[PDB]
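Problem statement: downstream parser choked on a complex file, so we are re-checking the raw output for the 2-acetamido-2-deoxy-beta-D-glucopyranose run. The parser issue turned out to be on our end (a line-ending mismatch), but while we're here, posting the original submission so the record is complete.
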Amino acid sequence: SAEDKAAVERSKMIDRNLREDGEKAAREVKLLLLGAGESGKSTIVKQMKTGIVETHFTFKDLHFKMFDVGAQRSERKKWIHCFEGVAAIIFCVALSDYDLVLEMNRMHESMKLFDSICNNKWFTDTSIILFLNKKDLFEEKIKKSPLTICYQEYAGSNTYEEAAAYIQCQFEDLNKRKDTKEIYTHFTCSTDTKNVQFVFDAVTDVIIKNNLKDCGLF
Amino acid sequence: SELDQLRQEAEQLKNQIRDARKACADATLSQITNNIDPVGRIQMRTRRTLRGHLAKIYAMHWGTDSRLLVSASQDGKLIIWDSYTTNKVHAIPLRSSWVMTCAYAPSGNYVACGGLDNICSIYNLKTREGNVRVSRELAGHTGYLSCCRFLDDNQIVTSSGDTTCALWDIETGQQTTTFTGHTGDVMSLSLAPDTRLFVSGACDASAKLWDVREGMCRQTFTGHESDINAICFFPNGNAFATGSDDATCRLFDLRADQELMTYSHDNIICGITSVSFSKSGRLLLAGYDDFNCNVWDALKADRAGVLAGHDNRVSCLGVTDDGMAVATGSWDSFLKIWN
Amino acid sequence: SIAQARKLVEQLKMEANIDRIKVSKAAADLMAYCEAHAKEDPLLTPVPASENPFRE
Amino acid sequence: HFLEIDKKNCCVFRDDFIVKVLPPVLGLEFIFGLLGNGLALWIFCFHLKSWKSSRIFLFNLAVADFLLIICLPFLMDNYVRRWDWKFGDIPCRLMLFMLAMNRQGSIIFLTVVAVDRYFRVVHPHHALNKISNRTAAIISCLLWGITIGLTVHLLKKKMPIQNGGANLCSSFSICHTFQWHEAMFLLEFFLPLGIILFCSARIIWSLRQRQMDRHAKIKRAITFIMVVAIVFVICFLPSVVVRIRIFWLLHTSGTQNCEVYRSVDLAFFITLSFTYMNSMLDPVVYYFSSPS
Amino acid sequence: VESGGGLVQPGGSRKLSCSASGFAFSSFGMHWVRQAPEKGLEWVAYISSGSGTIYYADTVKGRFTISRDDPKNTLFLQMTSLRSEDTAMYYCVRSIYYYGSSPFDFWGQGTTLTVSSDIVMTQATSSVPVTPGESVSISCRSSKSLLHSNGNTYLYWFLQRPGQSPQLLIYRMSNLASGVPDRFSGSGSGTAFTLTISRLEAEDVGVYYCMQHLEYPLTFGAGTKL
Ligand SMILES: *[C@@H]1O[C@H](CO)[C@@H](O)[C@H](O)[C@H]1NC(C)=O
Ligand SMILES: CCCCc1cc(C(=O)O)n[nH]1
């Protein structure tokens, strides 16, 4: 029992290091980054600064984990439940690919992917931070090309303010859980700041709702 | 227009296989084993509960000594338990916390893990001087690792989400053989008792019997209507059971090359996440999405008991090589040893 | 395109030219194997508590 | 009329209106309070699976309210007989200790609840929101200690005071001296109200500064923040104001004429019964009014 | 490897040190087994991993103090009242305890210093013929049976070649240590144990010690030289 009692305190020593690492992980914010590949996710990750890529960045004494799974190229349904529990979902859509095709134009492909991830059974209350990148190229493209190429039902002027707001509302319309989750839309420039601040604001709202769950108020 | 001719030829060839399989269906397993008395109600009590995981448990594997077991969880740690005294022999921190499979070497010197990182990592437990360290990181798969099994201390067979299985050599780290033929992500595999063959169930609702030496598929089994989530060889080695997403189980016979029995109930609508046989092969234990594990009588296709002790989805299942215990992990971060 | 279809037909022929046994013969072994090792199944037939390594 | 209690000139009234109002009201609080507090205690003990820092605090408030409720039927006997205690000397000290400490106990474990919610809405990234279940149990024991350690003096007082052919049991008697039990009664309300009002005003201010009021479940919680601030004022202000009027009369008229206090004495004890409503309204406001 | 120690002093005090090197020192429990100039081995003290349970010999219970420093990988032993009975070669022994671990696997080189109930292990035999190529058997007996309820007898066999530190051969009743050739075998009946050598080589000569591990005041067996 001398060797049996010495193995017990090895388990107790393993026990306390499990809790110390568990506390450290619980203080980290996990975000899931999605997109259409050429949707500007590479731009976004630089703004906050094979297999799965993990990005580490901090803002106002808060630690974020951002997982990019755009290199999987597998069936999304089988591994999408591993991310059930992230604070928020960061979605990247390129506003400049409304007329480019992959056939089918690339914008409808993103709306097809956005619809699946927004109405997923595993994501019924996780907030979605929608980033619409390439707004500068989108601004110049509409001057020579009409938005009717993408959506045949559009009826409006070929101006930045009218066309861009029309794209945003078509992305928020795909949300069927209009009462239990919220979608944050941000128009992002290729060279712009305060992108991490918008992520921090939409993540703090998740924490407040998470906190109010424990206290029973919400 | 040779493509149409080849496609038309395959349809006739496929019909020939179905006709031959129908000829050999002289009777049914239910009809043959209608005479045998039933096993009766089986009640299993939770003899032990292992705590220490702070996230969902996605995989487990018993040691060949029927005393040690290794469990994988998404908090980034691979924990080796002493199932008799609940003690933790080891705690291995993984490079990537996205782990979806775990393996224990039959010798007992190595363990393996893999997941969304597309890499199977071999960990040396012997550690002639120090603690557990990684030995070989086997890269080359395109998709996520779904399963991995040790043939020996130097050979491991893995299945990935790129619709291909592989055979590795730990000493060199190269794919000795690559098994192709699946059209969907391979979700599980099960080595034969003789180690010479293995099966693999993929998301295309098909199970394929492979040859480890030759490296090409021998037999294909169909009959499921959804993704096959788990597979397990019969102790005889001439049959296996599949657990799919349509809340049903199926027992296929290697020699008969066709379905034998099905294990379905109108009460259960939740798919099976893991299946396992007993030592004698009479009981077929299957873990479901509705938080309870089930015991089926493999010879009569009748329910025999419920292992209801988990709060969340049961993800992994295992039976000791001795056969005196069943360990059931789940997403509530607890493992339970039954009977 | 044509090569992939030819490969699929080539593999399908091998699975067609295989030796099969009747279900009655195949099902007999599973019933025989289950009965032959019935006494060596602790889950099917519980052993006395003095033999359980987990009870005590 | 007039009486001398512990060498102090105390005026005591035994009014007939007491028997026809309070025992009706006191009975209603006990039957519904026992049903409410008891049920909320039954659910907490076995029907709840996970315990966190915020839920244990709501358990202590349930304990404080439960202990206050069981003393009400003993009160109802005392008012029915028109201030005729027939239960002894030591038991009388038990209940006045049991009543004043529990009333302060429930007040303490709703300012903490109010402070707990404040740190989860206005300072969500504070370390105080992730305290373990042992830290809360350590805090609760300390708060219970200051609850007992502030009201122990009621046990040391011999209070089967004779009033002619009647036995008087009362910790609230109108007389012209300074005693600590009155300062505690005033500080039971004025200090906690400031914290509750401040916390309930900053929470609503923050939940609307960031436009989170669009949500429906959030919008329900905001009203319940205002409800607890309304119930607390409704339950405790009426008794405090009358005590201020009594304190005003003693400084401007004195005890030389123990007849002017005939109205306030009947008013105070009628309004003091409202402070037991808070011990009954809490389950329908705090526990049973939560999504979980 | 591990080394370090003190020197000669007249009846005073001294502190012994050990310098771990490349074996994850933080997770190993360390002993201070000592050997007199011509007596057998004798246990002194023990400190577990993380500086938890600490044990001392009955003869050094109050005078000696064992401490470890997980940073810098150094183990200490403080000797305050040094008598004439404790002049010996102090060895440092590492040991880890889990289900299948092998305690006492590695021993330090050891250093000498001069000053100018329990289970007794008999090992009655003290000398045997030195001829090679034969099959010698070394016997041992114990005061009480070492077969514990969990079913393994805590008897360890060590071999001290003449000139170097002892080396573990067999841990528990029959389990063989790593790096030891299969010529050595272990059989026991709970109280009486034997160690069998199939073929004797030129490096098998030396003194063989037997140690118990049931109760922590653990004792050796005075050796059986070949
Ligand atoms: C009570 O009143 C009398 C006169 O009315 C006065 O002399 C006496 O000091 C008073 N005692 C107290 C304790 O107030
Ligand atoms: C004991 C008879 C009723 C008079 C009374 C009530 C209280 C109180 O609630 O603190 N103190 N005194």
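For whoever reads this later: The interface with chain E takes residues 1-4, 6-7, 9-10, 13 of chain A (CB under 8 Å).
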